[PDB]
Structures are given as structure tokens and as C-alpha cells.
Amino acid sequence: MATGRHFIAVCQMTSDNDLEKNFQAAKNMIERAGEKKCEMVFLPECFDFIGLNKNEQIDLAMATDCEYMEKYRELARKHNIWLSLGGLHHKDPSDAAHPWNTHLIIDSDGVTRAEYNKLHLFDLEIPGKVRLMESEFSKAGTEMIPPVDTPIGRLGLSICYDVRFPELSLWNRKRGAQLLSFPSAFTLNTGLAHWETLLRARAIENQCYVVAAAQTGAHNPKRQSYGHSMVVDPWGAVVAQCSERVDMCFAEIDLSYVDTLREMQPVFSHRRSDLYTLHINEKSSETGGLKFARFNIPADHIFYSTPHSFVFVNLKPVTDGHVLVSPKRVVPRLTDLTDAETADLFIVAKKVQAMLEKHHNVTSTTICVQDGKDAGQTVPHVHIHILPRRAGDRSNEQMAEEAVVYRNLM
Amino acid sequence: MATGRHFIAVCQMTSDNDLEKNFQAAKNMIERAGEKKCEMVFLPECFDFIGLNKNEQIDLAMATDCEYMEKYRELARKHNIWLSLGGLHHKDPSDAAHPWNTHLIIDSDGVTRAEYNKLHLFDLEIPGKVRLMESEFSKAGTEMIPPVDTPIGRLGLSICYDVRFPELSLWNRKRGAQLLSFPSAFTLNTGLAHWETLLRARAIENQCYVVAAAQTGAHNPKRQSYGHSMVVDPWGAVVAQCSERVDMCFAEIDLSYVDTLREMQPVFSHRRSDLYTLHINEKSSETGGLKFARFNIPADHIFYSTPHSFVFVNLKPVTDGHVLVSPKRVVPRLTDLTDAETADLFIVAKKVQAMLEKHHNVTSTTICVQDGKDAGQTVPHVHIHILPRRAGDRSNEQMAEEAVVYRNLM
Amino acid sequence: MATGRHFIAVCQMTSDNDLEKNFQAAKNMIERAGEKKCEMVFLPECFDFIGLNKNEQIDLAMATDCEYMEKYRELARKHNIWLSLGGLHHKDPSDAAHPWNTHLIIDSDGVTRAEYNKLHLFDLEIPGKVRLMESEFSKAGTEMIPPVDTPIGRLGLSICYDVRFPELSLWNRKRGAQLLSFPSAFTLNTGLAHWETLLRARAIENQCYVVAAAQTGAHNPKRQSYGHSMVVDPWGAVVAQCSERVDMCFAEIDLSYVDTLREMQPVFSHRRSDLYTLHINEKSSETGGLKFARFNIPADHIFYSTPHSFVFVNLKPVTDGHVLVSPKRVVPRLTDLTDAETADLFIVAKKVQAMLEKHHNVTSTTICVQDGKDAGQTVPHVHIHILPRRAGDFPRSNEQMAEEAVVYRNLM
Amino acid sequence: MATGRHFIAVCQMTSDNDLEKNFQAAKNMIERAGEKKCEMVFLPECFDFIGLNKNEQIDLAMATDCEYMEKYRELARKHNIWLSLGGLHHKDPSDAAHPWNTHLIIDSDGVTRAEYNKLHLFDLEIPGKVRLMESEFSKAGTEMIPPVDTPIGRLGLSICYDVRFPELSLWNRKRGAQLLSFPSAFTLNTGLAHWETLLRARAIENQCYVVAAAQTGAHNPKRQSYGHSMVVDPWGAVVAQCSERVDMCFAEIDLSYVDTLREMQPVFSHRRSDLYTLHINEKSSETGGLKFARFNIPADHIFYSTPHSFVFVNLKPVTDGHVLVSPKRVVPRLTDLTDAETADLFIVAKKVQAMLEKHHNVTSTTICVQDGKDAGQTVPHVHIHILPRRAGDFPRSNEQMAEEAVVYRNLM
Numbered sequence A, B: 001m002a003t004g005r006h007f008i009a010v011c012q013m014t015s016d017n018d019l020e021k022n023f024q025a026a027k028n029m030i031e032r033a034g035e036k037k038c039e040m041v042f043l044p045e046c047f048d049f050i051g052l053n054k055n056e057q058i059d060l061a062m063a064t065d066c067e068y069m070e071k072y073r074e075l076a077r078k079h080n081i082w083l084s085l086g087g088l089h090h091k092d093p094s095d096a097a098h099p100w101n102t103h104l105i106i107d108s109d110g111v112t113r114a115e116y117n118k119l120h121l122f123d124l125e126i127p128g129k130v131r132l133m134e135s136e137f138s139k140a141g142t143e144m145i146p147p148v149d150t151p152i153g154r155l156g157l158s159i160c161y162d163v164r165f166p167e168l169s170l171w172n173r174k175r176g177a178q179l180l181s182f183p184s185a186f187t188l189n190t191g192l193a194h195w196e197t198l199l200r201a202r203a204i205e206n207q208c209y210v211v212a213a214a215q216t217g218a219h220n221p222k223r224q225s226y227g228h229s230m231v232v233d234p235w236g237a238v239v240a241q242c243s244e245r246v247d248m249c250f251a252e253i254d255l256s257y258v259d260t261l262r263e264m265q266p267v268f269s270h271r272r273s274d275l276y277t278l279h280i281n282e283k284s285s286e287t288g289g290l291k292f293a294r295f296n297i298p299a300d301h302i303f304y305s306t307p308h309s310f311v312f313v314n315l316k317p318v319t320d321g322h323v324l325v326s327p328k329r330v331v332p333r334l335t336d337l338t339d340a341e342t343a344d345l346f347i348v349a350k351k352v353q354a355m356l357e358k359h360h361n362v363t364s365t366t367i368c369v370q371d372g373k374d375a376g377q378t379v380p381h382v383h384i385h386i387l388p389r390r391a392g393d394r395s396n397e398q399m400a401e402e403a404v405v406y407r408n409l410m
Numbered sequence C, D: 001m002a003t004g005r006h007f008i009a010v011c012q013m014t015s016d017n018d019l020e021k022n023f024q025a026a027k028n029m030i031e032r033a034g035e036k037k038c039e040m041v042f043l044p045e046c047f048d049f050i051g052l053n054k055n056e057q058i059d060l061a062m063a064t065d066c067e068y069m070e071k072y073r074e075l076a077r078k079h080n081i082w083l084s085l086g087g088l089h090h091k092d093p094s095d096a097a098h099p100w101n102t103h104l105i106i107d108s109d110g111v112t113r114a115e116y117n118k119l120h121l122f123d124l125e126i127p128g129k130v131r132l133m134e135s136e137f138s139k140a141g142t143e144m145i146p147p148v149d150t151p152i153g154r155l156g157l158s159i160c161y162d163v164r165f166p167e168l169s170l171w172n173r174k175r176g177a178q179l180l181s182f183p184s185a186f187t188l189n190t191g192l193a194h195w196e197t198l199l200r201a202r203a204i205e206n207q208c209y210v211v212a213a214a215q216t217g218a219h220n221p222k223r224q225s226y227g228h229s230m231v232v233d234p235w236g237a238v239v240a241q242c243s244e245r246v247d248m249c250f251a252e253i254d255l256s257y258v259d260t261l262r263e264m265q266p267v268f269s270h271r272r273s274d275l276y277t278l279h280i281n282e283k284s285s286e287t288g289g290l291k292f293a294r295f296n297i298p299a300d301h302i303f304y305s306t307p308h309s310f311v312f313v314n315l316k317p318v319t320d321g322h323v324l325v326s327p328k329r330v331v332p333r334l335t336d337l338t339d340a341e342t343a344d345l346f347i348v349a350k351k352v353q354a355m356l357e358k359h360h361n362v363t364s365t366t367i368c369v370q371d372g373k374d375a376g377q378t379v380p381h382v383h384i385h386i387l388p389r390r391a392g393d394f395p396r397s398n399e400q401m402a403e404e405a406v407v408y409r410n411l412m
């Protein structure tokens, strides 16, 4: 994976409702980024456009794989450079009334390597005073995207308002991010007070470079952005920033500096996990079985998994729907688990419970945990018995037949 | 509770190992704070002293209620002013080798209204390079203290390094804090890069005033502090700061400004709780029973409680140790609970499990949850059956007799 | 004179065309300042009002002068506090279109203690896309006003745009200022970029506190201000700043601190007076006196003087108008003068020449300086002879001399 | 001349007394700059070394000049890049204790393009508790060095402490600078408070990019530097800054941007030249020419000139040494001159007077100016007569005049 020094360029622009003009601006900077042999170029949120009306910023929503986007993918190839499209107006075939705010990272091939959907939207609705609903022009993302590996390092993905919620960034760092990102279209009055401080703060708390390509100037009579597109190092210093205008800045991030800081200031090893736990709901994929004590549970027997736990079908179902929920960390007692695990184990149990009832169509479930010899534990590895109930109350090939049905319901 | 405008003074000093000199400096500023009719004065971490050796910063550790401290309590009375003693070297009768870093808030009567023990310590130990262990000169605090009500508003308590962990502050705001605090003795090189940014960041993310009284200058040949004691408003502006020297600054915080901002920018109503949850382990006191569906469980029947859940002794114990764990929020199904609740419910179940086994001296427990008619739920309110096991397997006056024994073990 | 600690209050506001609303905003803050026993409060630049157009600002100037000006003097007296009125629209009796932008300092008794007229105005005339003319709603000052002594120290005076010019502030510091002031109404876009840096820079490079009450928010549909009213110390630290709204902030200034810095960082003792000189046109006021060699020139005979020079009538003039320009420092050679003194001495000669030619109605003048025994110098003190000339051309009573001096004095 | 965008690199380092280590640090960065095709790199103030004592700094100055100076010129040529050596210990052949602090600009061919000697040194002598004397390890410059043209623009030159003095920077901007430079080694405690604000302020008030490579970290047990090497744009934005360590940062500067700002914010067209004047002693270099009324004074006869004035020998001198001082702008009256011109004209007269008296060995001088027909003025162009005087006292060949001018020219 990425290591050492890497040269990158951050783009600042003032997008119109004139998609061609907007494109030309960007293309011009990307070309210059290539000329300087940058490995990656970052563009701001709303890089595609910023319409006058909303029947406009919903009518122009693209497909991520459209003819406009191809112009970008074509550029990435042409200049052998990765791209960070800060926040595309992602049209949703089903709900055209609510596009997505998608941050895309593209290959030197033009191949999308990652997509992140703005998770936090601004919704203010004060009875008879003011009503500004971002959730009216767009739609929030539904899941947590982990950082992506790039030639310049582990890049955490976020967008604008996201910067305001520390939990999201702490998580990305925990998932091994080296650089955080916050392409944005900040307000002049908000940005002039919170932009630099919030970005520098994120970089310092997570000890990561922060790359924030932004919108600046007036997009139209009723909209102006703060600008100040910058790059912050893992120590909180602003090592690169654009001048007040449509232009770019350059930075040479050094992944080694990140390592040095994390080593000399092990903050993430100082967190009192015995007092607080930042739980995140993440859905991971198991391209290989998992250890249930000494036994090996086949990936085809697992229908849901997260970085802390997994759910697998039983070899001796005490009743239809009877599955198991155990922590990836091989541990026998519940009292041996850490809050992160305890919390994730039962929140997963909750997600699984609801699904088993929608399927086996019932309205009752029993959660049992045999922790100890005297309690009936037949295997030294914590497992939650989740068994749906009704009125009454194994084929290795048929066990994966069950696991498949559930996997599509999780 | 506190409302409106309130005038406060922040003290900056460079403490010696000369407790009398240090005292005089502080007393002088407190007197001036009184003269200006301030309602509260904040002093920095290590306000009592900063010794040359460690056999010194462990020998001088006080009692919180000693003759030195009385000088302060006497001052609070004399000038009718609340005090924030940023970080006293709190001697522990049992472990004299590890004092506490205690932030105290004192009455206009000299009455302690709150104590907070530094939760985060700096411990760096790189094999053959450098070894700086804060946990060698002192001892971390063991529990989470909630904000205290003061005449100037809901004051969240923290100390120095704490500022580096966002979770702690998000929690304090959630517990209704209006002002956060971070009295400190920051390093010149660290502070010159992270002080203002981290404080301004906390104020902005939690929309609270931030009061940080600090140490400055050189305490001795081998120790210098950053200083820059300040006050930040809920918008991130530094409204007051001390000059580079032993002196104070004044600020008039306006709790209404806090309300305005929180209303016009409802960030804490934008957090995706469906994706992440900041769980905190807090121990609350129930000076009154709780609703277990429609029934009323007596406080004397409850041995442990938190802002999300409670544990009470059963009216029909299926076996010794058989207790119940339910969420304060009256809900029937597990799938009706929020991650905060799910997580806290079972982490409490974990804490309770371990205690029941240390007492009933056994090594097995069963966790059951009858969620639904068909599962055997006899009451429409989620409750976890926690029943310790062995080989074999109600007096209202004797039920509180059990609850009392456990309460002292929780 | 003032020394020690002093408590002050800085006010921020959003002035519009509602004199009563602006006044009530200012009054509220002055009252709170008085309640906290502040010795002085600072109001921002257009504290009186910001009109929607030229004609309205003319009407408002009259309505302000007529009703509110005195109301502030009353507040000053009632709350026993000094006021710094950051820059009112001072209506000019003979030019209603161009009032001055006056910074007024009012004492505890409501008495004007000093008046600064904004010297720097922003004039942008781009035939193509722009025309922003501040001199179309105003008129720049005419004199350099030295710092005023106040209960909080030597206060230098200026108004926003003045910050961009270092010359102005360096001067005030040299003239004894311990605090500089920059009451103002900055544009949101320009303030958002230069406000803090400039105010802090002036503080640091001049080693003075900087007090800058400012306008903030939306005044009208097409006028916005940055805000961020603050107080910066002599080391450049922002010790107090208003929150984003119509409100105030408090700061205790310490003149001791200024002194301490001036001593551990004697920056002003390090200037290369030999390479560069900052000359300033300043007319001095004097009880009298002044030596010319061992001679005592009575004030009656001195009609113009600056911190560096003085001009006086001649007992034995070689011709009508023959006056003398001399440095206050008593030295004989022109080569004894410092660049600062040489610049002033001849720039003053330039002013006297013009004054004399207009008065005596001549069009020629001879400037002569005899430096040395062999050049005919009669007294060991540099003096420039300024001789008006006529086509004819080549002991006087005290009464004649005093009169001639009175005449010239009122033409300078 | 240079226009458009230009890529540059700024270097930060922790120089000590190990010339080889410091050089390898600098070399590494210059190579990386070359690899990125930068047109110019900036090294900090004491890039050569920081010694543990007076004697070591003298030894190191020799060892530097002997081996490393040329090595940098080689790097310049090899990597086809221009160098800005922030302030080497320039050993003075006749005073080993007081070298100059020279800022050198080396071009692509390793040729010195310009040399600035630090004009401002920090001297603190408090009989009581302190004695910090920079002039004890150095010697201040002697001349004002105007900006140098480079592939990246008009570069003004300075070294750290110079930032505190606005005069120096205002001048460079007036002399055409598009970028100001402040290579340096700031104290950790002073930089931590004034570094960013001052650099940014100079940028804003002069509308120039500011390039400041700096020392950082611990040099030795009792010497620390702030660091934070950066590049500020004409609007005051910090566009590039090194991380906390021995490393570099990159910035693309745009001369177009400077221009644009200079036009939408014509700050320098707004200065009150009528109230204050910033005079600077500068000796001009000239191909020749210069008119005196309708007369063409050949360079052969001009022995001293500044941006505002020139002095020349006389065809019909009334006495040995009779020369003339005149403003370059052709105007007849002394009252036609601007304060800037009046200050310069007589400060130059002051210098010529001294030069002539020492040369002709006299002790008296008569300075005379005839302004107007009736004052005897013969040509309609201001000219000051400078007449050396003797006890005796009161057409010349081109050869005599040219010679006399050569003599005087080498004494100014």
C-alpha cells in the first residue's frame, strides 16, 4: 500500500448552472495538475454545477456513469492521475426528487474506486421564521463507507457538513485513514468562522492530512461560498491553500510524517474505552469463513458480518430461524468482551431479530446466551441464540441455502 | 437554573514549587475578579504548584479539604464568587504514589459543588528513544462526571489533554452543558500548534462557551507552558484572552447566544444515530422508583441505574441472583430500542453479570429475553433475565435486602 | 498622566437609517459599560447611521447633530465614562454633500477632547466595470491629529481604511501613543481577509494596544460589514472580541505591559534613520520660547513651528518678508541636521515661501543659507533666509515685528 | 520581464555547526525542487550554519566560503534553478568579528544576481538583567538594495528582523517589488506570536507575495527557532507552509493576481503624500542623460543622482566646488516640488556639502536658490547652488568638468 511522499493538487472553483463552463474550469486545473505530475487532484462539492432553481438542481442530476462524467474519467486516463470528485449531484433512477451527494474517487484508468454519499444534511425548520431543508433538494447516504487505498495513502471520504461531526472522522482514522477529505461548498458567514478551525481540528485529533477542495465566490445572486480550499498536515498546519479565486494549490504530503506523529503522540492509545465507546454500524464482506472457537464456519453459512461480529446458520437448528451471533474475537464469556463488542454483538442481534420475523413472519423471539458450563455452553466461544417463535415450539448444502436467503434480507 | 448574561474572569499563571508564591498570584487575581463583581473565576491545571522533582509533585499533593485549600474556600466566601480550581494535585490516602488531577468547582460559601478527575493521561514509552509517563506522577479518574449547574450556566468539567478527545465533550454537551472547560498546563511546542484550534473546535462542535485557564512561561529550567488562557464563544470566536504573562482576562458570556445558535443550527439533531452511537458508561442515582411497564419498581429494589437503563431485583426469582435489566424508556420489543439503549442495556447486563458471580460465587450465567407473546413475555416492557447458574437449578422487605447488597457491589 | 490598569468596553453594532434604533443600541451598551465601571467605551465608525443614499445621509446628518449628538454627551456625563465615537457624519456647513468622517473623543463631562477627520478614503474609478467613490459621500480630513491623553493612556486616532497605511500609525507611536484605534465598518469580504492581521500587525510593530469597535451584519440589501470588534495588546494578542452580533466585549488594558515591551524589544531605537525617514507635516502649538543660538526668540515673533522647526520675523530684515526658518535643535551646520530635520526645515521653507509670496504678492523668492564663518554666518544656529523679491529690490520696533508675525501666523 | 504563473519551493531547516549536515539538508531540498521544475528555491537566514560561539562562527564563515558557497552555485547550475540564500555569514576581510548577514540571489548559472546586507539588527543592552547584542556577531548593511528581477518577478529583499519595519517594505513595493522576502531564524517565543501576522500584514499592505524560508527546531542547547516557513499571497493568504520539520513546501505564484489586486484596491494611489512622506536614501545608477531646463546635461558632468534628484558640475562656477543640485522632474519653482522631492533635494545637498568640504578642505558653505525672475533665476528649472567658501573668496573645458565630476563621483 501507499507509503512515502506524494504530490497532490487541490482545486477551488465557483460552479455555475453552466455545466460546460464548470467543466472547462476543472479540466484546466486537472491539466495543470498533470503537467506537474501530481498523483491525485481534488475537486469540490457541487463541482458539476450549482443551479439557480431547484427544479434545476434535480433536473441536472447525473448518473456517475454518464457522458458528462466520462469527460472526467477520460481526463484521469489522459493525465495518468487519480481524481476526487468532491460531491456529484447523483441522480437516483427511483427517486428523481432526491439526488445523492456523491464523493467519487476515480482511477488513472477512469475506474471508480469508491463512492461516498453525504451522510449529514442540513435541515432547519423553525415554524414561522425560516425553513432551509437540504433533505428537500437531495437525499442522505444510507451506509458508512470505509477509507479507500490510493496512491497517496488511505483516504477517508466525507463531504462538507460532515466535517461538523467528529464521530465520523474518528471512525475513519480508526479504520486506518491517513488523510481525511471534506470537499465543500461552505457558506461565507459560516465558513469565515468555522472552516479553518474545524478542518485543522480534524487533522489534529485524528493525526491525518486533511484535503478540502472548495467552492468560492458568488454562484448566483443568492449564493456565495467561502472558498479557502486547503490541505492540512497531521499536526494541524495549513501547508497549502488557494488564493481567493478560481484556482488551485499544491502540496506534498508525507505519509511518514503521519507515522512519526502517531508514534510520538499515541492519542488513540489513550482513549478511555472503559468509559465510552464510539459504536458504528458497518457491513463487511467475508470472502472466507470464520473461527467459531476451533471450528471453521464457512462463509456460505454466514449471512451478515461486521468488523466485530458475524451471524451464521446453525448445524442443529432448535427451530426454524434459529441462528447464532458471535464475536469474531474468539472469546468464551460475555464478561470477556469489550463494550465495542458487547454493543455491536447485540445491535447486530437486533438487526437480525427484525429480519427473521419479516421472513419467518412471526412476532416473537427469544435471545439466549449460555455463558458457562453450568449454563449449557457446549463451545468456548460466546454465541447468541436468536430463535424466532410461534405457537408450537443438517444438510451442509441446505445450510448455505438458508444463509443465502437471509443474506439478501440483511 | 442559570440564564442570561454572566460576567467571568479567567486566570493565567506560571506556578512554581513555591506554594505560597503560587497562592499569592492567584489570590491577587481572585481579589480583582471580585472587585469587578465577577460571578466565577477560573484557575489553571497545576494552580497549586509545579515541582522541580517528582518526589516533590507527590509529596505536596493535598487533600482537597486541607489548610491550603481552605485559603481558597475562604476567598470564595470573602469575594462572593464561585471558583474553578483547574487541576489540584489530589493526594490519595491509599496510593500516595499516584495523586489525582482534580478539577474542583467551589461555592460562594466555599462548598465544593463538583470534582472531576482527569480521565486522559499522556503515556509515551518508546523502547530505546523516550519514556514520558504521566501515569507515573499521577492517577487517572475512574468515572464520568456530568456537567455542574453554576450561576453562569451548565459547566462541563475537563482538564488539559482531555481537550484532545472529542467524545468526552460531545457527551458533556449531550448532558446539557452550556460551557466546557479545559484548565491546562500545555507544552509550548504542542500548545503553539493545537491550543487555539482544539478549543475553538470544541466550542463550535458542541456550541458551548469554552473556558480555558492556563499555565504560561517557564516553571523551571526544564518546563515551559504555552499560556494563552482564553474564553471562546459558542460560535468559535475568542472573546477574551490573557496577555503573555501572569494575569487575567474578562468575559461576559451570554447563555442566550448559546440558545440562539443551537436553534438556528440544530447540528445535534442531524447526527446519524442509525449509523453511529457514542456510548458512555455513567452511574446515576434513583431517588425514586421507575416504571416497569405500568408497574412501579421501588428505588430500594433497584441496585444499579444509568440514564438509559436500570437493574432491579425480581418479585419471583427463578433462582438466587435472578435479576432484571430493562430500559427506562417503556418499550416492549428489543427491536423497538435505539442503539444507544441496546448497547447500554447489554453493557449494563455485562457489568451486572460479573458482579452476580463474584457474589453468588459461581462461573455460569444465562441471559434470556422473552420478546413477544409466543416467547413468554408477561409484561410489555423489555427486560433481560440475568440468572447465575450452579449445579442444581416474595418478601417486599427482603427484596430491598437483596437490592442493598448488590448496590454496594455495583 | 495615565498609568496602570484600566478597564474598557468595545461596542459592535449594525447601524442603518434608524437613528433611534442605532442610538438605543449604543445607549444599551454604554449603560452596561458604565455599570461595569469602565473608564471608556468605543463605538464603531458609522455609529450614527448608514443611509440608503446620498440624500438620506444628508438628512440623517442633520437629524443626528440635532438630537443625538447631545444625547451621547449626556450618557457620557451620566455614566461618568469617556466616549470614542468612531466616525460620525460631520455635516459641513458649506458642503452638505461632503461631510467629514469624524472620530470624536468625549470626556466624562461631555466635552470634546479631540477630533480626527479620516485622512484615507477609498476611491476606485475603473472606466470599465466599477466606480466606488467614498469621496462622493465624504471629504477627507486636512490635518494630522496627534494622540489624545485619556484616563486609559495616550490614544492615537484613526478610522478603518487608515489601518492599511503604516505611516499613520508609526507616527502616532512616535508621538507617544500607547493605544491606537481603528473604529470602523469593513466590508465582509475584505474584513474576512485583512481585519485581524492588520489590526494585530499595527499592535505588534508599534507596540500599542489597538482598540477597534466595528460595524457588523447587514445594514441594508447591498451593504454588509465584517464585525469582529476587538482589542489587541502590545504583543499582538487579541485580548477581547465581540461575539457575532450587536454587542460588546470587555478588556482590562495595562500601560505597564506596553512599557515592559518597549524596553525588552527597543524596536524604535533600531530604525535606520540614516537610510530612511518618515516625514510628517504637523503644525505645533507653543506657549512660546525657542532659542536661536544663545538668543531667546519670543513667541510674539514666532509664527510657525513644527516638532522639528520654527520660523520667525527679522529685527533687521533685508527686505519686506525676510523671515527665518530654523531647527529647534540648536546646531550650526546644515550638515549637523538629521535627514528628518533637513526634510522638515525645507518643507517648512516651502510653505513659508508660498505664504509670503501670496501675502506680499510677489512671484520670486531667494532662499539662502550661510553655513560657516567664511559663508558669512553670524550666529551658530542653522537658519534659512527666505527673501521675497521685487523688481526694485536690493532695527524695527517690537510692535512692528509682533504685528507682522500675527499676520503671517494666520496665513499658515 | 517576468509575468504569469511561476512555481517555487521554500525550504525550512535546523542549521547547526555542521556545515556538511546543513549543506546536505539544503541540497536534498534543492534537488527535490529541481525535480518538480521549480524556477526558484528559498533557503532560510542562517542556512550556512549557527555556531556555538563567536570564535566558531568566524571559523565556520571561512570554511563555508571555502567549500560550500561554490557547491550551491553548482546546484544552481545543475538543477537549472535560481537560489535565494537567506542570509549567510559574509566574512569581512578587515573585521572577522563582524561579518555581514547577506541575502544572496543566485541565477541558473550560479552568478550572483543581487546582494542584500541586513539593515536591522537586534541590540538590547539593559545594564541590569540583559545583554543581547546581534551587532557583536555581525555588522549591519550600508545601502538600500532595490528589488531584483527574477524569473518569478520583482523580488524585494530582506532578512527576518526587517519585517518589523514597515518603511523597508513600503519602499520595495514603491520600487516595483511583486514579492517581498523575509528569510529568517525567529526565536520560538517571538515567532510564536508575530511570525504569521507580520508576514501576512506586509503582504496585504504592500500587495506582494511574501516568501519566508525559516530556521526551526533546536540548533543547540540554548538556541531555538519558530519555523513555519511559508508563502503568503498579495491578499494575505498563507498559500504554502512547511510542516514542523526540516523540509520544504511548494507554491505556484501568479503575477496576474498581484496586478488584479493592485487595480481593484489602488491603496498606493490613496496615500496622503501631502501629509506624510517616506524618504529613502538611494544612489541611482544611470546610463546618463538628464535635462536641466531645455539643457542636456551629459552624464560626464553628473556625479550623483537619486530617483528624485541629480547633481552636476558647473561650466561657469563662481568658485572651486560650485556644483548644482536639481530635481529630475523639470519644474522651475521650489514651491512646485512635492515634499518627497524637497526632502531628497536638500538631503542630497547635505551629502554634497559634506563631500565638497572634505575634498576642497574648507569649513564653510553657502547654499543658494534663486526662484523666480526677480531672484535672478537664469533657467526655469529648480537648482540649488552649493558654494564652498574660503577666506579669500569672491567657461571651463569639457575635459576639466568631466575630470572634476569623476573625482566627486568617487567620493559620494
Ligand code: EMC
Pocket: A045, A046, A047, A087, A088, A089, A090, A099, A100, A101, A102, A138
Ligand atoms: C448534491 C451534490 Hg452538490
Ligand code: EMC
Pocket: A045, A122, A134, A160, A161, A184, A185, A186
Ligand atoms: C449544503 C451543505 Hg455544503
Ligand code: EMC
Pocket: B045, B046, B047, B087, B088, B089, B090, B099, B100, B101, B102, B138
Ligand atoms: C496533578 C494535578 Hg497538576
Ligand code: EMC
Pocket: B045, B122, B134, B160, B161, B184, B185, B186
Ligand atoms: C500533563 C498534561 Hg497538562
Ligand code: EMC
Pocket: C045, C046, C047, C087, C088, C089, C090, C099, C100, C101, C102, C137, C138
Ligand atoms: C462618513 C462618516 Hg461614517
Ligand code: EMC
Pocket: C065, C066, C067
Ligand atoms: C437643540 C435642539 Hg435640535
Ligand code: EMC
Pocket: C045, C121, C122, C134, C160, C161, C184, C185, C186
Ligand atoms: C472606507 C471603508 Hg469604512
Ligand code: EMC
Pocket: D045, D046, D047, D087, D088, D089, D090, D099, D100, D101, D102, D137, D138
Ligand atoms: C549572520 C548571518 Hg546568519
Ligand code: EMC
Pocket: D065, D066, D067
Ligand atoms: C577554492 C578551494 Hg577552498
Ligand code: EMC
Pocket: D045, D121, D122, D134, D160, D161, D184, D185, D186
Ligand atoms: C535577529 C533575529 Hg534572526
Ligand code: NA
Pocket: A061, A062, A063, A066, A067, A068, A069
Ligand atoms: Na450527465
Ligand code: NA
Pocket: B061, B062, B063, B066, B067, B068, B069
Ligand atoms: Na495542603
Ligand code: NA
Pocket: C156, C157, C158, C162, C168, C169, C170, C172, C180, C181
Ligand atoms: Na494610527
Ligand code: NA
Pocket: B243, C233, C239, C252, C253, C254, C257
Ligand atoms: Na493586556
Ligand code: NA
Pocket: C368, C369, C370, C385
Ligand atoms: Na543670505
Ligand code: NA
Pocket: D156, D157, D158, D162, D168, D169, D170, D172, D180, D181
Ligand atoms: Na522588504
